[PDB]
Amino acid sequence: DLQDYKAHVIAKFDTSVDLHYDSPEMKLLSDAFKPYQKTFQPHTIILHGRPGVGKSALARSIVLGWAQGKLFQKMSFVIFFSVREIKWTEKSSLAQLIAKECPDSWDLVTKIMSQPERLLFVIDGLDDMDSVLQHDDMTLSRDWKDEQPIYILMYSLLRKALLPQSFLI
Amino acid sequence: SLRLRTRPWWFPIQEVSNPLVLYMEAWVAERVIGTDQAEISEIEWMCQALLTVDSVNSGNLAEITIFGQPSAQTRMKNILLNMAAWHKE
Amino acid sequence: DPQPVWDAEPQFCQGFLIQGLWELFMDSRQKNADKFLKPLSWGSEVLESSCNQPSTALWQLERFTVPQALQKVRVLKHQELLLVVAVSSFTRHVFTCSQSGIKVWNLVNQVAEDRDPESHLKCSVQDNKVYLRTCLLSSNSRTLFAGGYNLPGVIVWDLAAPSLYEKCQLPCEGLSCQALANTKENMALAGFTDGTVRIWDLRTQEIVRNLKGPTNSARNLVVKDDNIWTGGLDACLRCWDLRMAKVSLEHLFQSQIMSLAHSPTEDWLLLGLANGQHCLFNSRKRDQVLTVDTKDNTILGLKFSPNGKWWASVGMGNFITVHSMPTGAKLFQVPEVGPVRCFDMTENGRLIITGSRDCASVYHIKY
């Protein structure tokens, strides 16, 4: 079913061909999920810059390239949110929230068990998240598929609590 | 086009905003920097500034990028020019 | 029963315009001389003018200056009572840890009240219940130390790598840190609650020596080239030499010792008694002790100037007091809201910190 999802991902994004290439910028990003020194090895990676430049396009190319494969051998399946498209007022289960993005749901719940060994997770935005979010009261949920509000769920992945030994972009 | 470069946690986000690019002849510029990445990082920490050089144009001109506080940007430029002067002889 | 009332100290010009603009926005949708402070430029200097003097100094007397007042610039808010502060003028980072986490703040930011730290380095995740009370920062600002109560060791971090993480552990299973120290020869040592002073090799992470004495006798520790000074509830001062690793001096004092200090260039030593009595000692001559100042309240902290010409005092007397070196006379005072515990100073003698209950109040040294 993963091959079917990969083909579905391919059809979703075919806007530009110049952005998707095996540039040496790729081998830096692939080397980013590697220990710079033998003592310390990173897991969370932040790409920041001026809003106008193609940050979203760069993330889109990473999504498209994974369907072509060979982008990341330590890494199974991408989860793509765009916070501009969907509001965060309502509350729905994390498994339900990711069920809308991905075509199939029966494999998705079984996919979570295989996530910790090798994982991808991509975010766009959150600049409007922080201002809207009050941060006066906060909660942490340590289990998946729980019916929880999105921003408390979103806080959970970042702290590595809900996904131990995970990887971030 | 695009360009990527890692940013240390010690550096302030505000400091990253101003470039301090300096234009010097490419043969004079790339030779001073050196190929050893380890030596670059040691110089990077001592001055509390960021250094990144790229010579993509086929012409004999090269550009350098330095990031930091105005007092720190001065320190690296003076040393880099001094080493450039040394390479002449 | 005097009580201070706190006021918004900065009243910065930049914030005045922004605040005025907001109030007009809400007013429209309803039908349905002022004193400003100088901001800390780049987090390094204030760019002001010095004070006048009645006379001039010698040609050999130029860099030896003493302060005249202190001015508050920013307030840093932390959830729990902070117990230790650091300045690190090289990197402009202030360290204030307490409770489960360690909070690092950067001085580049320009804000009246600052609530978002650069990081929140927590310690309660490693094990269920461990409390910590102290930190130490290296002279080169490339290593951070922090000791606790039930920690299996002392935490060593790196400030030169591209990221922040843990490097060494320096185990101490059944001991409470309560004190730390470092020296030039690339190894460290700590003094626990039962007079346990032992030394680890910083690079190899191995124990090289162990020094044991009476319980509580190692509350205060001072390192030198080859000399180690201790002190505790026993009201006794002991000098240890690394070469043969045994006590060399012993002196009796009338009350408990609570603070220690050393001059950078001279050979003096400062002590703090439980009854507010200051004492001076010669590190080399070791002839006798002498007293200069007496205070009603106890003494909790003391520190010298970078040139070692003056010191400041902090205690539970609702005041902070500074004194000169030759005599110890009082110069000025600044009242606070609660009984202060900790303070620290820069390496270039420009700023100072002070924490009363839960928030650290950073002042500016006016020369």
Swiss-Prot record, chain A:
It is found in: Cytoplasm; Cytoplasmic vesicle, Secretory vesicle, Cortical granule; Mitochondrion; Nucleus, Nucleolus. Phosphorylated by PRKCE. Induction: (Microbial infection) Reduced by T.gondii in the testes and uterus. ATP binds at G49, R50, P51, G52, V53, G54, K55, S56. Disruption phenotype: Mice appear phenotypically normal with no apparent defects in ovarian development, oocyte maturation or ovulation. Cortical granules are scattered throughout the cytoplasm in oocytes and ovulated eggs. Reduced abundance of intact MYH9/MyoIIA and MYO5A, the dense cortical actin scaffold remained present prior to exocytosis. Increase in polyspermy in the perivitelline space resulting from a decrease in efficacy of the zona pellucida block. Increase in multiple pronuclei and delay in cortical granule exocytosis and ZP2 cleavage. Component of the subcortical maternal complex (SCMC), at least composed of NLRP5, KHDC3, OOEP, and TLE6. Within the complex, interacts with OOEP, KHDC3 and TLE6. The SCMC may facilitate translocation of its components between the nuclear and cytoplasmic compartments. As part of the SCMC interacts with the SCMC-associated protein ZBED3. As part of the SCMC interacts with the SCMC-associated protein CFL1/Cofilin-1. Interacts with PRKCE. Interacts with TUBB3 at cytoskeleton microtubules. Belongs to the NLRP family. This is NACHT, LRR and PYD domains-containing protein 5. It comes from Mus musculus. The chain holds residues 201 to 369 of 1163 of the full protein.
Swiss-Prot record, chain B:
GO terms for cellular component: apical part of cell; cell cortex; cytoplasmic lattice; nucleus; protein-containing complex; subcortical maternal complex. Induction: Induced by etoposide. One of its GO terms (molecular function) is structural constituent of cytoplasmic lattice. Residues 19-80 form the KH domain. Disruption phenotype: Embryonic death at 2.5 dpc. Progression from embryonic 1- to 2-cell stage delayed 6-8 hours. Less than 20% of the embryos progress beyond 2-cell stage. Embryos form unequal sized blastomeres due to smaller, dysmorphic, and displaced mitotic spindles resulting in asymmetric division. Decrease in thickness of subcortical F-actin in zygotes, thickening of F-actin bundles in the cytoplasm and loss of F-actin cytoplasmic lattices. Decrease in CFL1/Cofilin-1 expression in the subcortex and diffused distribution in the cytoplasm of zygotes. The keyword Nucleus applies. Expressed in ovaries, where it is restricted to growing oocytes, with greatest levels in fully grown oocytes. It is found in: Cytoplasm; Nucleus. Keywords: Cytoplasm, Nucleus. Component of the subcortical maternal complex (SCMC), a multiprotein complex that plays a key role in early embryonic development. The SCMC complex is a structural constituent of cytoplasmic lattices, which consist in fibrous structures found in the cytoplasm of oocytes and preimplantation embryos. They are required to store maternal proteins critical for embryonic development, such as proteins that control epigenetic reprogramming of the preimplantation embryo, and prevent their degradation or activation. Contains an atypical KH domain with amino acid changes at critical sites, suggesting that it may not bind RNA. This is Oocyte-expressed protein homolog. The chain holds residues 26 to 114 of 164 of the full protein.
From Swiss-Prot, chain C:
One of its GO terms (cellular component) is nucleus. Disruption phenotype: Females show normal ovarian histology, ovulation and egg morphology, however fail to produce offspring following successful mating. Progression from one- to two-cell embryos is delayed by 4-6 hours and embryos failed to develop into morulae and blastocysts. Embryos form unequal sized blastomeres due to smaller, dysmorphic, and displaced mitotic spindles resulting to asymmetric division. GO terms for molecular function: structural constituent of cytoplasmic lattice. Induction: Induced by E2A-HLF, a chimeric transcription factor containing the transactivation domain of E2A linked to the DNA-binding and dimerization domain of HLF. Induced during TNFSF11/RANKL-induced osteoclast differentiation. Keywords: Cytoplasm, Nucleus, Phosphoprotein, Repeat, Transcription, Transcription regulation, WD repeat. WD repeats lie at residues 33-69, 77-115, 127-167, 170-210, 213-250, 252-291, 294-333, 335-366. The keyword tRNA processing does not apply. It is found in: Cytoplasm; Nucleus. GO terms for biological process: actin filament organization; endoplasmic reticulum localization; epigenetic programming in the zygotic pronuclei; establishment of spindle localization; flagellated sperm motility; mitochondrion localization; negative regulation of transcription by RNA polymerase II; positive regulation of embryonic development. It comes from the Eukaryota. Expressed in spermatogonia (at protein level). Expressed predominantly in ovaries, where it is restricted to growing oocytes, with greatest levels in fully grown oocytes. Expressed predominantly in testis, heart, lung, liver and muscle, and at very low levels in the brain, spleen and kidney. Expressed in bone marrow-derived macrophages and osteoclasts. The modification Phosphoserine is found at S305. Transmembrane segments: none annotated. Belongs to the WD repeat Groucho/TLE family. This is Transducin-like enhancer protein 6. It comes from Mus musculus. The gene is Tle6. The chain holds residues 146 to 581 of 581 of the full protein.
